[PDB]
Design an enzyme around this catalytic site. Structure first.
Site, PDB file in Angstrom:
ATOM      1  N   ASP B  92      16.377  53.508  65.037  1.00 41.70           N
ATOM      2  CA  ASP B  92      16.260  52.142  64.557  1.00 41.70           C
ATOM      3  C   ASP B  92      17.048  51.196  65.472  1.00 41.70           C
ATOM      4  O   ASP B  92      17.750  51.638  66.386  1.00 41.70           O
ATOM      5  CB  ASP B  92      16.636  52.012  63.079  1.00 41.70           C
ATOM      6  N   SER B  93      16.914  49.898  65.251  1.00 41.07           N
ATOM      7  CA  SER B  93      17.475  48.929  66.186  1.00 41.07           C
ATOM      8  C   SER B  93      18.952  48.669  65.932  1.00 41.07           C
ATOM      9  O   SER B  93      19.650  48.149  66.800  1.00 41.07           O
ATOM     10  CB  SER B  93      16.727  47.612  66.075  1.00 41.07           C
ATOM     11  N   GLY B  94      19.413  49.020  64.735  1.00 39.61           N
ATOM     12  CA  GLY B  94      20.775  48.739  64.314  1.00 39.61           C
ATOM     13  C   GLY B  94      20.887  47.470  63.485  1.00 39.61           C
ATOM     14  O   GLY B  94      21.885  47.266  62.793  1.00 39.61           O
ATOM     15  N   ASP B 270      10.371  57.135  56.513  1.00 38.06           N
ATOM     16  CA  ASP B 270      11.726  57.689  56.568  1.00 38.06           C
ATOM     17  C   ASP B 270      12.376  57.556  55.181  1.00 38.06           C
ATOM     18  O   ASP B 270      11.940  56.739  54.389  1.00 38.06           O
ATOM     19  CB  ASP B 270      12.559  56.968  57.637  1.00 38.06           C
ATOM     20  N   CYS B 301       7.453  75.313  45.205  1.00 37.51           N
ATOM     21  CA  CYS B 301       8.055  75.031  46.502  1.00 37.51           C
ATOM     22  C   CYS B 301       8.282  76.292  47.329  1.00 37.51           C
ATOM     23  O   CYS B 301       8.840  77.269  46.830  1.00 37.51           O
ATOM     24  CB  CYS B 301       9.389  74.321  46.287  1.00 37.51           C
ATOM     25  N   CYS B 303      10.223  76.519  49.965  1.00 37.86           N
ATOM     26  CA  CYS B 303      11.448  76.436  50.760  1.00 37.86           C
ATOM     27  C   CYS B 303      12.387  77.622  50.534  1.00 37.86           C
ATOM     28  O   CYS B 303      12.278  78.337  49.536  1.00 37.86           O
ATOM     29  CB  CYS B 303      12.175  75.105  50.547  1.00 37.86           C
ATOM     30  N   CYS B 306      14.375  77.646  47.212  1.00 30.23           N
ATOM     31  CA  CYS B 306      13.641  78.055  46.028  1.00 30.23           C
ATOM     32  C   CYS B 306      13.269  79.536  46.046  1.00 30.23           C
ATOM     33  O   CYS B 306      12.943  80.100  45.008  1.00 30.23           O
ATOM     34  CB  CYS B 306      12.416  77.169  45.820  1.00 30.23           C
ATOM     35  N   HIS B 332      16.170  71.686  50.189  1.00 40.82           N
ATOM     36  CA  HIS B 332      15.031  71.660  49.282  1.00 40.82           C
ATOM     37  C   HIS B 332      14.329  70.298  49.281  1.00 40.82           C
ATOM     38  O   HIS B 332      13.098  70.231  49.324  1.00 40.82           O
ATOM     39  CB  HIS B 332      15.425  72.014  47.844  1.00 40.82           C
TER      40      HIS B 332
HETATM   41 ZN   LIG Z   1      12.500  74.219  47.317  1.00 35.93          ZN
END
Ligand SMILES: [Zn+2]
Ligand SMILES: [Zn+2]
Lengths: 366, 366
Positions: B92-94, B270, B301, B303, B306, B332
């Site tokens: 980002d530009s700040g 984002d 999920c 991940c 999980c 997660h």
């Molecule tokens: Zn998960």
């Protein structure tokens, strides 16, 4: 694998190297046990703890009985399942942290009642309740419940606490043995007390050996006496313990404490944020000198942190209070300890441990 | 790979799916970018960020210019090398964080001077200096420096800030182009402003398209206007932007914000501690109801969190303030966002995204 089998493969002087076989795995000795406080080794997944080389971790009973609770952990399937570590776990008795962390503590021959430092709730520990809590957690190596002796202690008070501790050691032994599932699957260690006094240490060793344990801890050290005195006490204390069982020095040892303790016959160690260990001694990564240092924490370390990130980056993270800073520092430091243990084991196996200890010290303190 | 190539593979309504090819890697769109603040995605190693499915991360320039410093990062080899993420980074530009985090701020047509919120040191940002800092970091996608418009804003003030932002967009374009290494290897995105006003949004889109950018962000939203208004503004704003370039909605979108924004033509997102995302809506893991819940955070999920740990364990860690709690929750949640993006991409590719959005909402808000 058996419930418990300690085998000594090689020796040099008082130093030994070998293995403890248990149902959940093999522990290479001399061993360093990372410390899990409230069911977590700080900032590390269990897989990362294992990747550093750890064969066994320590669980702090005092913290666990407060949060999330021993009965709750049992209901949820035990500590191993709860935290995701499937290898052996040694649990402490809870006694030391009751003394050092709890409030409104009341001691008696039966045990100790105390208030939580977290919620002020009232709790109790006795030899019987400590052994039960360690069972509820599903501990592989259970520590007998004792009464710690502050440093310094008068000969009278050291004798009184040692004597009570030995009475409590028998109560711990009997509680452990009366619980079939625990007796058949876990091991029980006794704790030698006696402060810095040789005669009390001898009486304690004799009492413990008469009761009989799977392993023997040297308790009451690393509590302010300094390395010289600790080494002096170990010099006479460790030979009093049964040779054919593991010897466990309780309490944080710096790398140099560990080397000297192994020279004196110790087989097992534990030790629970800007300090990073290196073979040339510890550094404080917060120091401004590291702000543009592209070298890893240590030049030889094989850990994942030293393969991937610079001192400059870790310096930045720690100064910024970033969680990743704690993660990386902790992984490196535990990995360093494990590499130390491996060098110790290999040098004893090759009959060059005395030389290793000398070389290690010359460089670490240069 | 080219410096920059955005290709649209499939469409449904205003929604698009495709790829951005850049020198450091391919970005699948619609894309979610985890946020790295002071050169770290909070509580995650870069390898873990990648394992969740992220193709690109965002770096916050404001934080980086304060600590460890832009010139320092350049001296150390750039942000990618410093933090250990070798794939694309959008910086980002700040500007936004100067407005929201810094003190003693003084705005002018040239830029902004301000005092650090950390050390009170004085700093400056202008279109030219922002582009230079992003170059020093080694950013792959550079954001033009603009002047943010608070919500709510009067038509006059929204017009003034939009007009200044467009003057600054040209200055950003020229600064980027004059630096050969940056122009040849990085991309530059412009930012549409204009608050909630259709005519100002149109003027801004026209000005940006006339200058020409590699991608176009919708700025000035997710700043208190609420989802209904944000969606209303996106309805007319996104079609004003060039169709054949990526469209980036700046600022934290909840899962439902992302789905609706994709329905309106957005390609990039984002979003920067007890809240866990699930397909049945968010849960607060601190809630006592989870203390003995052995199910994973989410039932579907994929991940690693999980697969391995229970709600009960994560509840305990978060209540205890343990670092591992933050590590597991963050992994997660970012993994959940990436699975959301994958479902979005697959559904657009298969011409069933409208149905997916309806099914998603019905369940998420049940
Ligand atoms: Zn998960
Ligand atoms: Zn290392």
């Amino acid at each position: 694998r058996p419930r418990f089998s300690f085998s000594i493969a090689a020796r040099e002087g008082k130093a030994r190297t070998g293995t403890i076989e248990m149902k959940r795995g093999v522990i290479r000795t001399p061993a360093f046990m990372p410390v899990g406080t409230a069911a977590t080794v700080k900032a590390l997944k269990p897989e990362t703890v294992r990747a550093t080389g750890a064969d066994i971790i320590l669980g702090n009973t005092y913290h666990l009985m407060l949060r999330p609770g021993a009965e709750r952990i049992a209901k949820l399937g035990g500590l191993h399942s709860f935290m995701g570590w499937d290898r052996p776990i040694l649990t402490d008795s809870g006694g030391y942290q009751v003394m050092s962390l709890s409030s409104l503590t009341k001691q008696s021959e039966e045990g100790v009642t105390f208030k939580s430092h977290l919620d002020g709730s009232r709790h109790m520990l006795s030899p019987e309740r400590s052994i039960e809590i360690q069972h509820l957690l599903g501990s592989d190596i259970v520590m007998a419940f004792d009464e710690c002796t502050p440093y310094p202690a008068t000969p009278s008070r050291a004798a009184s606490s040692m004597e009570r501790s030995m009475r409590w050691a028998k109560r711990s032994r009997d509680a452990f043995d009366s619980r079939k599932e625990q007796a058949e699957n876990a091991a029980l260690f006794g704790i030698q007390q006696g402060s810095v006094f040789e005669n009390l240490r001898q009486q304690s060793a004799d009492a413990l050996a008469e009761i009989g344990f799977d392993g023997y801890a040297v308790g009451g050290l690393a509590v302010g006496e300094g390395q010289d005195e600790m080494f002096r006490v170990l010099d006479f204390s460790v030979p009093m313990l049964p040779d054919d069982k593991p010897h466990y020095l309780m309490g944080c040892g710096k790398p140099d404490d560990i080397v000297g303790a192994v020279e004196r016959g110790i087989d097992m160690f534990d030790c629970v944020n800007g300090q990073a260990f290196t073979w040339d001694g510890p550094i404080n990564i917060r120091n401004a000198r590291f702000s543009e240092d592209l070298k890893p924490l240590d030049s030889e370390c094989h850990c994942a942190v030293c393969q991937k990130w610079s001192r400059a980056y870790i310096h930045h993270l720690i100064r910024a209070g970033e969680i990743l800073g704690a993660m990386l520092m902790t992984e490196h430091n535990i990995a360093f300890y494990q590499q130390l243990m491996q060098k110790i084991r290999d040098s004893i196996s090759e009959g060059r441990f005395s030389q290793f200890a000398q070389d290690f010290r010359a460089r670490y303190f240069a």
